[PDB]
């Protein structure tokens, strides 16, 4: 078929004898051979626009300040916690002793075991930083 030749950013135009036509505004085609361009994702509500939509790529969403993206292609907005905390059902809770979190997102991780590498502990870990091992 002649449609297969139409590249990303265009669609095989059924209204004009299968010519390649540029994608209309608010639409994209990140692949070739499409007969229609896909509608761009609207980054609104809890979502905010990070990368605007173009004929060759979909709009990429971000979250509202105090929140971070969850899942593939920013499908959800998860609440930010402080460094040295993690998110639970009852909100942000400090890392338990022996665990840390150097990020405003994610869970508390136990400190690295220096003794495993035959290394000494030079600086003990905290709630926000991992242990610093010797040489």
């Amino acid at each position: 078929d002649p449609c297969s030749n139409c590249p990303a950013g265009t669609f095989c135009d059924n209204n004009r004898n299968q010519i390649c036509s540029p994608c209309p505004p608010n639409s994209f085609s990140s692949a070739g051979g499409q007969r229609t361009c896909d509608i761009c994702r609207q980054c609104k509500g809890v979502f905010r626009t990070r990368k605007e939509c173009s004929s060759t790529s979909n709009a990429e969403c971000d979250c509202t300040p105090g929140f971070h993206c969850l899942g593939a292609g920013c499908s959800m907005c998860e609440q930010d916690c402080k460094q040295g905390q993690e998110l639970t059902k009852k909100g942000c809770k400090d890392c338990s002793f022996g665990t840390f979190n150097d990020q405003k997102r994610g869970i508390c991780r136990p400190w690295t075991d220096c003794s495993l590498d035959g290394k000494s502990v030079l600086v003990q870990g905290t709630k926000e930083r991992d242990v610093v091992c010797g040489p």
Partner: antibody
Amino acid sequence: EVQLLESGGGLVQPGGSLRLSCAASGFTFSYGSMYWVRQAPGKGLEWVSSISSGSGSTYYADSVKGRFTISRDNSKNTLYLQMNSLRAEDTAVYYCARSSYYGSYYSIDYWGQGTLVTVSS
Amino acid sequence: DIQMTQSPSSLSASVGDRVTITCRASQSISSYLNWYQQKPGKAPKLLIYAASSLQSGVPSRFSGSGSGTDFTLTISSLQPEDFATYYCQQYYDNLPTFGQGTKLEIKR
């Protein structure tokens, strides 16, 4: 504010080459097309070349096909027209243009001021 | 290729008069037809798109008609500012051919 500015126009000897530039501002070339349209003194508008956004798919009028090349340097937001094997019939004001989307298709809406190309010895 | 034949090449008509400009395509172009107005020293201005759709900011005196091969531009009541060269342009095949133009003189 959408602004288009052509440069590179001037006197050129028949058989020669000339490269036109069209500097754009006030928009991102993420949708539609950009064009080159020429006008011979006292004659009608002649569409010569098109370039699609994203892909950079090009189209040429039969009158310039094989001699002229349209290209876009997005990093510099500059549209080019490389014009080879020029003859007296190529003498014209050369305009770069930008599309707008009306009634389910892209068509010429914005025009630059033009650059005069004279093919003479 | 797609050829665009405009009729007539030129015409003279008085302020208040009604004029019609023809545009014929060598093959069917559905409604993918534009009308532009070119005044001396000014960039061409889009008057009509999709054969009959009047562009916003364009007076109701300018009107379009047609589908396929035969197209018509009419100006219902000419003004002195209407002096220009009118061009049709087809957008059916990625090679947007302009009509040869119609030069409109205002009679006085």
